[PDB]
Amino acid sequence: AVHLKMMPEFQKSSVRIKNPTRVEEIICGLIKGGAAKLQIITDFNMTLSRFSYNGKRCPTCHNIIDNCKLVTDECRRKLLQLKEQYYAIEVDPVLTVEEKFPYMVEWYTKSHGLLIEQGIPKAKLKEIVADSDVMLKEGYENFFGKLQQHGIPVFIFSAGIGDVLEEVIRQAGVYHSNVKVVSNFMDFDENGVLKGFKGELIHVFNKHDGALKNTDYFSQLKDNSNIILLGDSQGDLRMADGVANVEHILKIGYLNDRVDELLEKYMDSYDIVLVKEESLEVVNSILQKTL
Template sequence: MIFHIPWIYVPVRNVLAIWHQLTKYEIPELKKPSVIMRDRGRVEEIIRNMHGAGPGALQVISDFDMTLTRFAFNGKRCPTSHNILDNSSLISEDCKAKLANFPKSHYYPIEIDSSLSVEDKVPHMVEWWTQAHDLLVQQRIKKDQLAKAVRESDAMLRDGYEVFFGSLKDHSIPLLIFSAGLGDILEEVIEHNGVFHPNVRVFSNYMEFDKNGLLCSFKGQLIHTFNKREGALLNPDQFEQLQDRPNILLLGDSMGDLTMADGVQNVQNILRIGYLNDKVEERRDAYVGSYDIVLEKDETLDIPNAILRYITEGK
């Protein structure tokens, strides 16, 4: 009977409407134990802004290896795009030994050493990638064998990848992948899983094949862990086409991935999600201080999928 009185009914109705909106768009996945947020309020504000602008204002910029792909499965490390080729039958045993030894003993510890500056790390990364690519070129790899190497590998996209790629396609949201890996291989991985949709663009290290289909060199500027920003700036035309998409969801697994969106103009909202896969205790503080959301030992795309569902819901 009381709700028939207008001066009581209207405020109550407004309160109920607000409560409905808050509960309708809650993201329970953000309460997962693997999720760490430096500033939850700021994260929620960014996500609300993205929802308000809708999927038409959004683009996703992501790393590939150990970000869109799993870091491990059943306690075993999964291969990166380089590892897929390094461990395949296309590579001689001597070459495999060389590729396996120098990264583990020297370069990888430098890459993840939080006490070193990026400037100090870059020369080592260039040396690492250049040596690896030179060894691959010596193997005279056949282009038509790359798909077979991927099929026979243990590479796995993260759980929930069908929903992730499918949602981006269904809402026409561009997915820009910046990778220091092997572009030819990672494209095969995406294709093999049936999710290489028209909205996907890849910027990576691509192989050059001669007239006989044999690997003879690598194309363009070398892309390593810490120069993806330069890779972005080398593709201004791509970003100019996305100027009407000022909201960015950025996914990475290294400190170098934080600059992948630096080529984008007029950014309004950017949410950085970082996968902390390895050496969690010693790297946690650096990741939490740099990424908006940190996912510890999380082999899924549950959080990106939940955020995408929130942004696109009702749109």
Template structure:
């Protein structure tokens, strides 16, 4: 099946391809040298209020629910909304200044996956749209990409964005709230942009959760979708669900080696 999808995408050429990807723990590393890397929510928190976040936001309570494959999406969704709302409200309470974001990213150990330069540059070279759907914080996400020098014109981001007051201080988060299991709503809320991509019916989808599988649902007339899933955590107990859902499953792989190889083959025949 995988070989057939790749062959079909290659035959159609890069002009018919778009890439849809999650960000945290998909384009960024899950861990480095045995230590967990921060997400776009915790990139700020690592430097400003990590202690408060852990104590008040109960990260140890919600994360196991998010990755529990025995629970239905319907059961998880209200709990995810609760988690994200608490996290956003906590950040607003800290009166974070916009100028602190770049510094927080520079001082954090946030890392894109090995091979990111080739990934972003290849997509730019062939004018292949990269649509990033993230339940994290869009302001931080963009800063990470910009800090690494790969925020090219073909990159579009759909995420949770901060709203600032006249003093440049965080005062709210813009609607709609995007969490792990409603990313396809971003597609439905941006029909004009997605309408421009209808002539690109072939999709390479990258994610690290089962919720990421719906990210391409807003694309009408999709013909070939290759779904690559990063299985970063609790591998043994989650493997079966991932193998049943993704076309390719990468276990504890902190690189973009496989997506890059596929993209090189599709665009250059190598």
């Protein structure tokens, strides 16, 4: 049997679990299925990457571009101001998802407009990422390493910028063959210069959509009926909506901001809530028991 009381990673003050006996049962289910039945569905920004480090806020994939040498200071100022205004709406505890939705569309349209005007070259993304302040969560090597060792499908579903994300994990040497990325990918002109974004916009509150547009991926993993889902937003709860068959699903949520106002809602919707936590130690311990 699984006993959370016997696992010290589960007793750390950052770990908030509303239903410990249900979390035990789910983890027991994952262990029973082992590698053969497991798949991962995870968010990127502030879920696999850090929210802050040494008392400083860390960048999202968009922020990497916002802050880089290939954007003018005037543009960066506009982008900072958009970030201030619209992040405040994104995390606002008083608004509903449906109230936030149009403002998120609008943030993305305005910010992507401004990035396209700057003409970001594809060939420069490597240096831009190498010079950024992006940081992955503590334990990321063992997370991606254990998963690849056992061939576990990992679906990274991000409303950020796909080219940036891929370059972060590529440089960190964890972009292994088991990793699939779905995000907003840049569209480049004949010069290799940013001219737009491909496909349909993925934003904070429409991941349900993209989840269903990936049923080919999910239909090939019908046997992978045990799901670990990681996110930091309420909008990440929908990332598993396209899975073919769900037998056991564990939802782990990183609560990084407005903690007192959001704790109850996060504890009601995620099986495990990780409060101001910059490591993957909890999920890594579950993997250790499972694989």
